[PDB]
Amino acid sequence: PDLLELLMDLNCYTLEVTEGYLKKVNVTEVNDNVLGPIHVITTVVSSLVRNGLLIQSSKFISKVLLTVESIVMSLPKDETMLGGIFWLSNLSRLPAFAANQKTLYEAGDEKDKLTLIYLNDLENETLKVFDKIYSTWLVKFMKHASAHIEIFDMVLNEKLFKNGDEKFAKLFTFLNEFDAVLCKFQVVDSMHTKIFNDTLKYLNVMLFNDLITKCPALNWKYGYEVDRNIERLVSWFEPRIEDVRPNLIQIIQAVKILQLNISNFKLLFDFWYALNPAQIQAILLKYKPANKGEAGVPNEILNYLANVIKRENPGKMEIMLSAQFDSAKNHLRYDTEGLATVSKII
């Protein structure tokens, strides 16, 4: 009918969506409104698929994903959190949408094998883009949030080991707003959870890298104080997700090592992989006795470690950490103008 004719004018309804709706949405005025992008998007695709216009759907989705990625990439530092969550929440439903569409073309009725293949792919691909955008935004978001909430001075700075009620209060208040926005913008439960687990994974990297670079003196007492802070921070996460600490295993082991002994080790490291020989050295080469004029790291031990390093130095070793996140795969379970509307009415 007049629908098919409408649906074939690709360039026109694609431009309405990316330029007239998407690139304009203001997250500050969003609230409802949250799932507006996904609604518009799935409305068009659902119609296109129902009518066999697969290359069209492909074209439309491709342009839409480039637009959303660009918007998020160019988000202003003061909107990185609201905007990143808003958009990812929306894009987070594409895979579930794709999967659900498949039920309409399986079985009952005739099986449109090609459409299934199209949908199956739509799901795999929208997940690939969601992952790429997610990872990039989480690192950026957390890079700025760590600075603003002063995590290093709150957790690792020794000459500041006297207070941390001032800062931790602010941290918990940052986490509360974070959690609230993920709620308000309807991020799915599993995705919500994953976001906190990954947030901790980022902090693991940041805390560990900083410990090795901005902390000159380390000792048993440094371990007790730092551990006490890690628990303070982990407490907020404890009730909200399961398995909090494993996300912080490098900073935690590093700290447990400091609360050490003096007498030979060989059995507790010759097989250690939570932290590698070169990383344990980096920690222990910063050892400065707490009590002025006290014991340090037995050179024979520091020596065994030094020896184990040299032998398989393979082609490298690696001390610094880098944040890497798993695919949101098993975590994404769920349930305008002219042309854009004219479609929505048929």
Side-chain angles (χ1 to χ4, degrees), residues 1-187 189-346:
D2 306 304
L3 174 56
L4 184 53
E5 194 174 308
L6 188 69
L7 293 178
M8 296 196 72
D9 186 16
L10 185 76
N11 180 46
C12 189
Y13 57 80
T14 291
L15 267 49
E16 264 207 50
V17 174
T18 74
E19 306 310 313
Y21 177 65
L22 263 31
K23 274 175 167 185
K24 295 192 192 311
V25 168
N26 234 66
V27 180
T28 67
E29 298 168 5
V30 172
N31 68 238
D32 284 359
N33 280 174
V34 210
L35 300 198
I38 191 63
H39 167 66
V40 165
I41 301 185
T42 59
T43 280
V44 173
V45 173
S46 183
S47 190
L48 283 171
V49 176
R50 182 173 63 256
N51 297 276
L53 301 179
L54 311 186
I55 294 183
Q56 274 91 187
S57 173
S58 171
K59 296 294 192 59
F60 176 73
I61 288 295
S62 167
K63 186 69 63 59
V64 163
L65 302 171
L66 285 177
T67 306
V68 175
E69 167 173 43
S70 165
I71 292 177
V72 172
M73 211 86 218
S74 314
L75 230 42
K77 59 286 174 51
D78 58 295
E79 301 177 305
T80 285
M81 171 170 61
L82 278 292
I85 291 178
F86 168 66
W87 289 121
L88 285 169
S89 187
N90 278 280
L91 294 180
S92 79
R93 292 162 158 87
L94 272 174
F97 167 78
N100 182 80
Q101 284 295 113
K102 285 192 289 184
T103 68
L104 310 175
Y105 306 88
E106 299 182 312
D109 299 292
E110 285 296 2
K111 177 187 179 183
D112 183 314
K113 192 49 181 174
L114 205 71
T115 295
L116 293 183
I117 287 179
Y118 173 74
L119 267 358
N120 201 177
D121 187 66
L122 176 60
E123 170 171 26
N124 176 76
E125 306 297 297
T126 61
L127 172 61
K128 270 185 176 64
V129 173
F130 173 88
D131 278 356
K132 190 213 311 171
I133 299 175
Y134 173 81
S135 299
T136 297
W137 161 86
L138 186 60
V139 168
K140 180 193 188 184
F141 169 59
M142 282 307 293
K143 189 52 174 291
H144 185 277
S146 298
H148 175 280
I149 208 73
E150 300 177 56
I151 276 156
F152 177 80
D153 282 336
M154 187 192 299
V155 181
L156 302 173
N157 200 294
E158 83 135 69
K159 46 196 57 180
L160 201 35
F161 280 169
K162 189 185 66 176
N163 205 59
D165 289 23
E166 161 233 356
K167 274 118 97 183
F168 275 92
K170 182 189 173 184
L171 164 71
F172 295 126
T173 305
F174 161 76
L175 264 31
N176 285 326
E177 178 160 2
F178 186 19
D179 179 290
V181 178
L182 288 165
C183 280
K184 190 161 81 79
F185 285 8
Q186 297 183 62
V187 170
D189 249 79
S190 290
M191 197 53 229
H192 196 303
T193 288
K194 183 185 189 303
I195 292 172
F196 279 163
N197 271 291
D198 289 341
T199 285
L200 290 169
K201 289 191 181 187
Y202 176 84
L203 291 172
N204 173 63
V205 168
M206 189 236 93
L207 292 174
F208 189 71
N209 285 353
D210 279 7
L211 173 74
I212 301 303
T213 60
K214 311 164 70 68
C215 299
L218 306 181
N219 41 65
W220 65 274
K221 181 71 182 180
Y222 183 83
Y224 267 80
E225 303 273 58
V226 167
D227 172 80
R228 170 179 290 121
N229 301 333
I230 293 179
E231 279 313 304
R232 193 92 94 70
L233 167 150
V234 167
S235 79
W236 188 85
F237 292 91
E238 279 254 65
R240 300 170 171 59
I241 67 183
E242 302 170 355
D243 298 69
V244 165
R245 299 180 184 68
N247 288 300
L248 301 164
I249 206 62
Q250 280 68 37
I251 185 57
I252 289 188
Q253 289 306 304
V255 157
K256 293 297 170 187
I257 282 182
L258 291 183
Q259 290 145 162
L260 74 216
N261 70 53
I262 359 283
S263 304
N264 194 295
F265 186 91
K266 293 185 176 180
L267 284 180
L268 303 74
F269 291 101
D270 195 303
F271 73 116
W272 210 244
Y273 298 100
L275 216 52
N276 76 35
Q279 292 169 320
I280 295 165
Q281 214 217 196
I283 291 158
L284 296 189
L285 286 180
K286 284 167 164 55
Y287 207 99
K288 177 204 162 192
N291 302 173
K292 292 291 73 190
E294 272 286 270
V297 177
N299 293 309
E300 60 181 3
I301 284 179
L302 201 170
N303 204 61
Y304 166 54
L305 175 48
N307 280 164
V308 178
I309 294 172
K310 187 171 59 187
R311 83 165 60 180
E312 77 289 60
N313 273 315
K316 296 289 165 50
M317 187 50 121
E318 218 66 296
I319 291 175
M320 296 297 92
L321 298 181
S322 63
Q324 310 234 176
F325 310 116
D326 300 334
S327 160
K329 178 69 149 300
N330 312 311
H331 290 268
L332 300 186
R333 23 49 65 185
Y334 283 96
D335 195 322
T336 300
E337 308 145 296
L339 297 69
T341 305
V342 185
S343 292
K344 189 176 177 290
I345 80 165
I346 320 166

